[PDB]
Design a protein around this ligand. Structure first.
Ligand SMILES: [Ca+2]
Length: 46
């Protein structure tokens, strides 16, 4: 019994509850607007 996450399976759930592609997460461009997809990442890209 798997628990279905928010948004699509291949989608990411931003802090703003936005549903973007998981391939957009931490791609050095804020997709969620608030940039939560970029904030949830561990790299010194600045
Ligand atoms: Ca992004």
């Amino acid at each position: 019994t798997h628990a279905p996450a928010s948004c699509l399976d291949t989608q990411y759930t931003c802090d703003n509850h936005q549903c973007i592609s998981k391939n957009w997460v931490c791609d050095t461009d804020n997709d969620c607007g608030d940039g939560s997809d970029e904030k949830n990442c561990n790299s010194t890209e600045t």
